[PDB]
Amino acid sequence: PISPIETVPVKLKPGMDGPKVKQWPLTEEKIKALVEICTEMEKEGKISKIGPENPYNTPVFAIKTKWRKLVDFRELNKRTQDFWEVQLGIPHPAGLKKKKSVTVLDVGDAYFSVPLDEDFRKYTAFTIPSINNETPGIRYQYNVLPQGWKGSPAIFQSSMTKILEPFRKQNPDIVIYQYMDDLYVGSDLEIGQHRTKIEELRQHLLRWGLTTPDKKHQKEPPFLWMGYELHPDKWTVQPIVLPEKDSWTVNDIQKLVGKLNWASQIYPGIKVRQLCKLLRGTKALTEVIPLTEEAELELAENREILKEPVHGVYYDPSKDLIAEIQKQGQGQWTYQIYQEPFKNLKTGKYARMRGAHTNDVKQLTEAVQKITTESIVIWGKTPKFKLPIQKETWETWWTEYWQATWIPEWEFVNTPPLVKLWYQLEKEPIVGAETFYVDGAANRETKLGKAGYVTNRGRQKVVTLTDTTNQKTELQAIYLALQDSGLEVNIVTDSQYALGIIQAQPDQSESELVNQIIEQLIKKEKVYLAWVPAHKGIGGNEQVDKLVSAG
Amino acid sequence: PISPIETVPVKLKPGMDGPKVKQWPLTEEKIKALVEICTEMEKEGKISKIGPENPYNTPVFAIKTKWRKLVDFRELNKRTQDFWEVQLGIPHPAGLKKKKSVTVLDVGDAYFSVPLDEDFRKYTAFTIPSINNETPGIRYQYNVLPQGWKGSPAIFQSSMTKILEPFRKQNPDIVIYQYMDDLYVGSDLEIGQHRTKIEELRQHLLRWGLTTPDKKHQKEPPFLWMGYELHPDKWTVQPIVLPEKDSWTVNDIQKLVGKLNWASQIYPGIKVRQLCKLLRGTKALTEVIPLTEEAELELAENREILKEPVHGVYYDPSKDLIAEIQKQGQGQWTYQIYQEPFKNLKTGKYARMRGAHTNDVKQLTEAVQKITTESIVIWGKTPKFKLPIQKETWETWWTEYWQATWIPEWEFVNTPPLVKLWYQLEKEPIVGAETFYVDGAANRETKLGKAGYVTNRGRQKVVTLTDTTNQKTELQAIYLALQDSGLEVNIVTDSQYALGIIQAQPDQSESELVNQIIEQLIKKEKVYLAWVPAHKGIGGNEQVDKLVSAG
Amino acid sequence: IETVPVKLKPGMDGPKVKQWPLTEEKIKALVEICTEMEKEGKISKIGPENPYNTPVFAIKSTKWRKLVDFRELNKRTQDFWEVQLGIPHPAGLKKKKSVTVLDVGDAYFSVPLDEDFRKYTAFTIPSINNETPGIRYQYNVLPQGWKGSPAIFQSSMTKILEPFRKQNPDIVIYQYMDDLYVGSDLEIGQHRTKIEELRQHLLRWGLTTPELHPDKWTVQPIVLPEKDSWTVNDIQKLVGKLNWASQIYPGIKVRQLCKLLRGTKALTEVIPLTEEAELELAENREILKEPVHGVYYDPSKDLIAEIQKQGQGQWTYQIYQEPFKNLKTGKYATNDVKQLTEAVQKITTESIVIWGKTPKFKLPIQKETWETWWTEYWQATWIPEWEFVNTPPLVKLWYQ
Amino acid sequence: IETVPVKLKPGMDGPKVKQWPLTEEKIKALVEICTEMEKEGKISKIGPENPYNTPVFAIKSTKWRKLVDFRELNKRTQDFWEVQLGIPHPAGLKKKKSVTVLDVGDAYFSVPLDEDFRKYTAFTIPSINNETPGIRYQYNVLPQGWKGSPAIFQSSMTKILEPFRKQNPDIVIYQYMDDLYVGSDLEIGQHRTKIEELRQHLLRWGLTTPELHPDKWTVQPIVLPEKDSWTVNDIQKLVGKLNWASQIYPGIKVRQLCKLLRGTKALTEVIPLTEEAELELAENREILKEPVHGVYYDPSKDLIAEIQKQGQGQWTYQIYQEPFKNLKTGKYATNDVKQLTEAVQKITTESIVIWGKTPKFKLPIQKETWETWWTEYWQATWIPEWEFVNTPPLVKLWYQ
Numbered sequence A, B: 001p002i003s004p005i006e007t008v009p010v011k012l013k014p015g016m017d018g019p020k021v022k023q024w025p026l027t028e029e030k031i032k033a034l035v036e037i038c039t040e041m042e043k044e045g046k047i048s049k050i051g052p053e054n055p056y057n058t059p060v061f062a063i064k065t066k067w068r069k070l071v072d073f074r075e076l077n078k079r080t081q082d083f084w085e086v087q088l089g090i091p092h093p094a095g096l097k098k099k100k101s102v103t104v105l106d107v108g109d110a111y112f113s114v115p116l117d118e119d120f121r122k123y124t125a126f127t128i129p130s131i132n133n134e135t136p137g138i139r140y141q142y143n144v145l146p147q148g149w150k151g152s153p154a155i156f157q158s159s160m161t162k163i164l165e166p167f168r169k170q171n172p173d174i175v176i177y178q179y180m181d182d183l184y185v186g187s188d189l190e191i192g193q194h195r196t197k198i199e200e201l202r203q204h205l206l207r208w209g210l211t212t213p214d215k216k217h218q219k220e221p222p223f224l225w226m227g228y229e230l231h232p233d234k235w236t237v238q239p240i241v242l243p244e245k246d247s248w249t250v251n252d253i254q255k256l257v258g259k260l261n262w263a264s265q266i267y268p269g270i271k272v273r274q275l276c277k278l279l280r281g282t283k284a285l286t287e288v289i290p291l292t293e294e295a296e297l298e299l300a301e302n303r304e305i306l307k308e309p310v311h312g313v314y315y316d317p318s319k320d321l322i323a324e325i326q327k328q329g330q331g332q333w334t335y336q337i338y339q340e341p342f343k344n345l346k347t348g349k350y351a352r353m354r355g356a357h358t359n360d361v362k363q364l365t366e367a368v369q370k371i372t373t374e375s376i377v378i379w380g381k382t383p384k385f386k387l388p389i390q391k392e393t394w395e396t397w398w399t400e401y402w403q404a405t406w407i408p409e410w411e412f413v414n415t416p417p418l419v420k421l422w423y424q425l426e427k428e429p430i431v432g433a434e435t436f437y438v439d440g441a442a443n444r445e446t447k448l449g450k451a452g453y454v455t456n457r458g459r460q461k462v463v464t465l466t467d468t469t470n471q472k473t474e475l476q477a478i479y480l481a482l483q484d485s486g487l488e489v490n491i492v493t494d495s496q497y498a499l500g501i502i503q504a505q506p507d508q509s510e511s512e513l514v515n516q517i518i519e520q521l522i523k524k525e526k527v528y529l530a531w532v533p534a535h536k537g538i539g540g541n542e543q544v545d546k547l548v549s550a551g
Numbered sequence C, D: 001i002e003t004v005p006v007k008l009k010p011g012m013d014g015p016k017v018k019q020w021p022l023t024e025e026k027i028k029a030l031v032e033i034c035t036e037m038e039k040e041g042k043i044s045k046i047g048p049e050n051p052y053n054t055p056v057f058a059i060k061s062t063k064w065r066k067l068v069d070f071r072e073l074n075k076r077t078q079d080f081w082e083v084q085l086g087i088p089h090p091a092g093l094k095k096k097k098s099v100t101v102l103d104v105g106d107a108y109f110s111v112p113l114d115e116d117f118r119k120y121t122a123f124t125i126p127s128i129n130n131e132t133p134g135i136r137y138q139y140n141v142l143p144q145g146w147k148g149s150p151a152i153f154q155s156s157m158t159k160i161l162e163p164f165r166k167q168n169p170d171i172v173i174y175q176y177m178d179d180l181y182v183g184s185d186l187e188i189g190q191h192r193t194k195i196e197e198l199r200q201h202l203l204r205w206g207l208t209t210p211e212l213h214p215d216k217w218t219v220q221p222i223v224l225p226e227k228d229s230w231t232v233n234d235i236q237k238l239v240g241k242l243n244w245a246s247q248i249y250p251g252i253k254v255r256q257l258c259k260l261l262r263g264t265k266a267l268t269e270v271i272p273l274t275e276e277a278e279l280e281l282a283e284n285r286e287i288l289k290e291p292v293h294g295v296y297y298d299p300s301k302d303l304i305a306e307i308q309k310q311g312q313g314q315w316t317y318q319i320y321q322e323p324f325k326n327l328k329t330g331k332y333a334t335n336d337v338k339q340l341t342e343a344v345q346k347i348t349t350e351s352i353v354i355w356g357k358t359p360k361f362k363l364p365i366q367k368e369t370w371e372t373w374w375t376e377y378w379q380a381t382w383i384p385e386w387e388f389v390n391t392p393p394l395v396k397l398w399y400q
Ligand SMILES: O=c1ccc(Cc2ccc(Cl)c(Oc3ccccc3)c2F)n[nH]1
Pocket: A091, A096, A097, A098, A099, A100, A101, A102, A175, A176, A177, A184, A185, A186, A221, A223, A225, A230, A231, A232, A233, A314
């Protein structure tokens, strides 16, 4: 059928006219299949013969027992207005409330069951060519949403939504999820009452031109849907087989990571870092990459996690969400969300590096943020967090840091390794400690550096660097001062860059130099870092700039 | 059976002792299945009961009608020596010589058919626990390559190779490819003579402990192997379905790109750039990403390419290889390799950016290099290239550039768009053209810039920049000079950085500033660029440094 | 009661901005509000042939309220509300003893919106877990939060206010977005009595209506401390403040203080403050009380606000058009985000009073944190521009 | 005929370096050579219990030849061939009129290799399209290309050469890797007659054997042109050369020349060369003929060679240990890669003669291009270290 629903008005893009594409001479087999297929559509109202006055045209093709009409709408598509996006997201199973019964209905001939705007139909004109193009072809236009046209997905889903609205209003306890040609209908009715309700939905859908399968054809839970398996009172990802291979190609490792990532929604503790590190560089798709030992280690631990099947639970809005995060190595974090202790709704991980340099406190907060946004999407509220960080550690860090942040309700849970700051810079200069005035200088052309210092105790030193920038030399200077000083030291720099990095108490960095600075800072008992303006003739800074400025 | 082949001697890592891991108390069902499974292996020589003197142990587990013994060799693996990699690569079908007949033989119980080093067996000790661990467990050790042990893949393939060597030597026209448990055997014998030869291979393999399937169980070509389909006189990738979706998740786009990339080995003209651009940023795995119009455009063109099936041919060493490259948009290149015009052996693409700034000539040469290395891998020789660049264009560029390069035998082919340089910097200063002395200055702390110039005709100008580095201001200066000058201009800078970038005639850049400089350079009729040392009191450079040095 | 045509210009399409995820209570709040608005004819459901989108949020007492984020539409429609139908800003408003801010956005729902422009006002109520496709609407009347609304309505507003202005010619009234800023020099009781009088005027035209002291706004100076005794470190910080201050203020001097730091000294070492130094220092303090010589508001340039977190609930800020050429500086003083959103609102309100427009903010906070939380505490009817920046720790130090 | 124990040190495992793809003719060449070597007992097939790998290549007349790349093993075994069994380098070798380079690597196959060390010499003949798993071998005798080979063999080499040295005490012989460098001051015919005499000595110990003029090696100076008339541009380039030269050479002066460039001049404008300038300039030329004052070979530091492509088949180069503190400069003058590999071999040969070791090269070429093509033209028995660098276009200009 063709739904009696009102059409959606459709326009071409402001400046543009409809498509006038030439029909390629087709093969008799193909011309024959197209005529057959079109006759059948004509007799069901889907298409209509049109006069030669209509100046528009789109190419048509047939491809294989079985013949398929394929219309190339590329030009029309370029010419037709933009439409509203069909969805902002897909549902996550963890977000679904458990229903006593759920049925899948698939709408038959979805697009062809929905009318196209009368004023737009002319632009969907196409021509079945005659044998060797000798004579005028047979001309049609669509009365319904064509396959491959830009507006079909959007106009269909919108039509289905208008059509469903009344049923939804008079059945507010039934949940219907629309997904392409499919309808997933769930209720907490007794099985017999449910099947009655499905039947009057099917009737309501038939009233509006949409056919649906009989009960003997309706699919049984578990439903495979979008990479998930949806069971009566649990869900999981579809089965993951990590293939056994002697040689791993770039392509296999890509696919492995994709599956592990997908698996991480419900399998806790999955890691992907060491496998990801292999894919760096520019290697052929079919090129074999020797697994490192760390990749080997990571892959084996993933296999232990995946040996026993794991499932998630559905959502119950009468309870709170609790999110827990564990640190699993550098950069890597892992989380579980549950309502009742250890019956997970879902699982996940966070690896991301924000910036070049960071610390565990910063990372945890970023992980809390990612999980917070995720929870508002899936459940429409934030969870209560349980974090492996002391309130005192957190308090100390964010009250002193210069960025604003704020995480919602959380509690400490002793699940080591614990997040802690590994050093703390002093608030005041240190009495009885040597002041190192540092500086770095690099020739822009020869890339030849001088990093060094002078102290208040008369110590002076100037090393020679090669292929460094000005930024590296100012960091090299600070490193020298750390290496050559006691357990307590004041350091004076004229580099705001160096200062910024170090004042954020990083404990982790992409830069090698910075990691060496971190090692030192950890070993010190007290460090005070200070800044002065360059070339302003300041005592100490002037003295060092001399011996550092050489070439 | 257990091959009579001599064992490979195996060591633990120098400092380490064998594993002493404790057996977790198991379930009766599991204890029962393990005893059953072990009895059966014992009766076939695979494992042997051992005394309580052996101090080593590895955990064992059973997992599901069907019971599977799973030994957790993680600790042993950490402790056992490194082995030689099993392969440097896998064969590409395009490289395969066509055989009249090809059979697949799969070795049954591969690992368990190969002996383990007598001196190493003790480290493979494991314990079937008693009910509730009350009494001493039953103790075994492996006589053969265990499943999950680190050396099994390597020792197996090496064993198979030693075993095959003689047969290979006395049958130099047969081709045998080893891949895990599988053997692919090809010949140019008549079908009856072939089956005889397969049978004496099977006999030779049985002599050395390796069972293989009977003729009624041998697989028929086409062989699915490693994502390819291998037909009697053609090959292709396995069928690719680009799913129709209303909403694309990060996960779907990842999988789409993987399939397109895989498809690009034989389907020409496939693109992935616009789809890849979407995956940038840090988005959830299940997050929907609206397709841009360019992504939409790219996806539709990929669908046209994939509508009709395409195949590749096998290799004939009696002919030359010809490689052709076409430019398909910025950054993107496409290639076909064939021996007879348009019967492709294989296909591919190259997108990569080497550096921040580049030109089409540089890119083409990088594409020629990638294809050159690929051809030596697959065919052991370099192809004759057919390139969309004039000999004169190439000659001019590489004779003048400061890097060395060299591509093998090639010819021009007029398949537009043609690779050309879009501008050329002058070799000598230009008479009757205005000299712009440029300079850029940035405060390291406030990030406040001054880019400007002075000319020999007395023109002076100094703009104000904000949140720029010193490098950006020196580029901004050059851009100003280009904007405010005639069709001919000399420009003098003290920035080696700016010079380097521009002297390479880039026509494409990651930097916005650089692309604006490129637009200008293209529109000029003549540009001469020059360098002088900063702060050396050079006329013009000194005059500009004044008005540029302000804050 | 008959519509004013609206353009975008030739080549700039409408907004296509994503809807940021909303919590359940806010979503439910929005569908109540919207179902009512539809029944009242103010908005209409729309179909997928409208490709445009503007985000919506719900904010606050117990009354929820709809807040549409027209920042994009406003940029794309700037020629209309600024040059074609501009509302002049009175310089006198900042001079007043007391300024009261009244919400007048209800008045805009009475005027119909140009039918050719309605599509550009599309928005979306999303659903939890994307379970239902999300409810789509556009406006049939002048929407709150769009700058075209007051632009269009100003003709009516003048009628409405004519009696009140005529009877109170030393009270200044200024419309900005959905607010009326009403300033006077009256004593506070008389000022408040006049505000209530104004509500009654407004109440006759349908608008049931939901105290700044700008004359007592004085720049927060860069503070040079006075000390018992100065360490080497202390002077280095003083030279640092003054140095960067001298890039803003004509006449700032550090030469004397700089000689006091002779060579390679201990940071901890006390130093005698020379009379030449104490002179230069006292003269620097004088310069820092006064406004910056050389800086002026340029009506064609955007305002920019930077905010530094100073700890202990203290926030400092600077408004400028060219970096560091400050037009205004101040401070503000419960969690970081809550306070930051308070600072932003206070700064924006001041800016509206002073220059008749809102600055683009440089916020010291992670994008996602801000986006998750800002509407939890936001009270205003407008939303200013923001980007997200890492504060240089030195700029924080120089402003206390 | 009985082996010398070999170590790596405690904590540095053997080489695990990948085999770079080889063309068919080279692969076939290698399996012939290797099948023979195995029959002769020199190498043995190995199994997968040997995790190590060193790359192999084939080079050239019609005779192919095996070239193993022991650069890694050499680094990891440095204490043995350098400090434990070092070969002293004679300073006199560079002073000789003529130096002849003889290949003596055949001699090493006669000595057995320490059984505990053999595993570290593993290599792999790969196959086309990875069709067969690839043939694995290790050495049973001292391998060509390993620095331990001459280290171990030097005791025998001394015996072999004793008669020749005793009879010709003003000829200097130096062993480096698989070569003997033989220098004399004899007239060329007499030099050549002595080389043949040496071959016959060597021939008695099994070694069937396959002309530098170092005294006539003189540094390529930084060239200051002499000109009819100087443009502003010309002097700017001269000031540029001299400027960067003054970072190498004590005493270089540009002050005079710099005043000649007064203000904002046309690059094309001709300028009269002042006498003060022509003086400074002529004195600069004198400094640039002589070697750099202050730079010395440091035996504990690695040598580094930079090469610039000058166009028209011209190549310039510099050897140094600290950047730009040049120990030597030169030039070299068919495709780019071919020529570059010629330059590299000439520079390495000079370095061996002069300091007794080879530099790490900074090559102006794409990694992959170099790797694909270098063995197509490489003639030497050794391979130096290289990295791949982008030439700064100014450094190219300053060296002509
Ligand atoms: O018996 C069951 C089985 C699953 C569920 C969870 C559940 C509840 C309601 C509906 Cl519409 C479901 O169907 C969906 C299927 C795919 C995506 C979203 C929803 C769904 F999967 N509830 N009860």
